[PDB]
Design a protein around this ligand. Sequence first.
Ligand SMILES: CC(O)(c1ccccc1)c1ccccc1
Length: 268
Amino acid sequence: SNGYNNPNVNASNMYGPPQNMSLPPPQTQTIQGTDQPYQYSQCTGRRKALIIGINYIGSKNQLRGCINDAHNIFNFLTNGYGYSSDDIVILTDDQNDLVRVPTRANMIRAMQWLVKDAQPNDSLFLHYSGHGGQTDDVIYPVDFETQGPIIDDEMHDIMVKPLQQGVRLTALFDSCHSGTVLDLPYTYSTKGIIKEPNIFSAADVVMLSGSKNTGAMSHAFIKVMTLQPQQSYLSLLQNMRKELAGKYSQKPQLSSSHPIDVNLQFIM
Ligand SMILES: CC(O)(c1ccccc1)c1ccccc1
């Protein structure tokens, strides 16, 4: 009998969250044996999103569905989750406004914009679909041939390092080899903790990515949250894995800047 690993199946044929699921606690949390507080966001504040989809149109490794992944996430967030269009920057390489092209400079600037002046209980969302690689994990702006990639340490320095206690950053990567792209120290799978520090931000950073067309992670995330919006961190992972099974060769993982009580409700 294992309700962690073997959850019951509900009327929608999906894995059920815990019978009694709590919202993340408002109080400052601490880690035992050290002085490193953190705080879950209540997500009652400002909601902003940066969404990036790159197809590398015209190049030798043009991709087919990344721009579409970006549009899917834009639609999902604006229509479901209170992200206003004035509060979203979407960068894609098939449209006609240069300042919205995902060049390296525009991406870096947008990353700075996303987290600028972020207050406790704000909810920030980052989505990336394009080429990913490991050298460090890195991502590839449309002009990477001349400007190079953006590496994990820089993305951590721009988007994680400045965050105040209790600011949520939720990140969703559809790219390959992006599991450590924000240098986060905790990693969770459907089967439990798979990485944690052996001994830190006080913010609330969580990220979803896949490990071994269209974006598998955004596909799974959007379908699960559309059909059954009530999920814990763990049941969200389990249900995404269930949706991906057979069709996709990817399994979802959750990384975080702090320990997660995976039975808490996943909110945004
Ligand atoms: C998206 C766009 O095709 C582009 C520009 C630069 C690199 C890749 C793609 C564009 C946008 C505005 C003006 C010119 C070209």
